[PDB]
Design an enzyme around this catalytic site. Structure first.
Site: not given
Ligand SMILES: CC(C)CN(C[C@@H](O)[C@H](Cc1ccccc1)NC(=O)O[C@H]1[C@H]2CO[C@H]3OC[C@@H]1[C@H]3C2)S(=O)(=O)c1ccc2nc(NC3CC3)sc2c1
Lengths: 99, 99
Positions: B25-27
């Site tokens: 997960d690059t995000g």
């Molecule tokens: C959890 C992951 C599986 C899904 N996500 C993408 C992650 O990349 C998310 C991006 C993010 C970054 C920052 C803030 C909010 C969010 N990363 C994250 O939450 O990271 C957190 C924690 C980790 O370490 C630190 O770094 C950042 C912070 C912090 C603590 S999403 O956004 O929920 C997400 C995105 C698209 C999506 N599409 C769906 N379609 C439906 C299914 C058909 S469902 C769906 C859910």
């Protein structure tokens, strides 16, 4: 380009005539942008992430220029804390993970 | 390997003697795993994502084998809906984004 991950992989995008920064996010199925003004019809939708769910507006066939590459697809608009480019658009610009 | 993004980029990991699947997960800044039994000390932490925040236990200097590559670093354990390998470990296995 090749992008290493010592910093967040942020790119500049142009969408709906506006310039934004967004995260290239391999963990995201779909593309979710912070609240912004987008033209046209949309459908309400709920998506889930680490802390629960948010309500978003779903826009289809939206053109985005991501780091200079053109793509068209679904964009979700709502109260995400960060603009996220998800796999639905990453596949269109040919993005891969390598190690 | 090179990994395209038409499907979720899931890999097999071994952590704390257990086999799991996790999303590259690059995000994600940090690595967050679903509730699991880990041995060491830990520290209370709170992290934020798309729908709000969750409470996690922070474990430091944890060994993970990710797709056969070894890394040591901080792992967060809590009510994430999916096991996520974040940039703190992706950098250690040499993972890059390419397009
Ligand atoms: C959890 C992951 C599986 C899904 N996500 C993408 C992650 O990349 C998310 C991006 C993010 C970054 C920052 C803030 C909010 C969010 N990363 C994250 O939450 O990271 C957190 C924690 C980790 O370490 C630190 O770094 C950042 C912070 C912090 C603590 S999403 O956004 O929920 C997400 C995105 C698209 C999506 N599409 C769906 N379609 C439906 C299914 C058909 S469902 C769906 C859910």
């Amino acid at each position: 380009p090749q992008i290493t991950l010592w910093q967040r992989p942020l790119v500049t995008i142009k969408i709906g005539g506006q310039l934004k920064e967004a995260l290239l996010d391999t963990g995201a199925d779909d593309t979710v942008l912070e609240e912004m003004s987008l033209p046209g019809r949309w459908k309400p939708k709920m998506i889930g992430g680490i802390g629960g769910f948010i309500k978003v507006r779903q826009y289809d066939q939206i053109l985005i220029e991501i780091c200079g590459h053109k793509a068209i697809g679904t964009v979700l608009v709502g109260p995400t804390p960060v603009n996220i480019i998800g796999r639905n658009l990453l596949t269109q610009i040919g993005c891969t993970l390598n190690f």
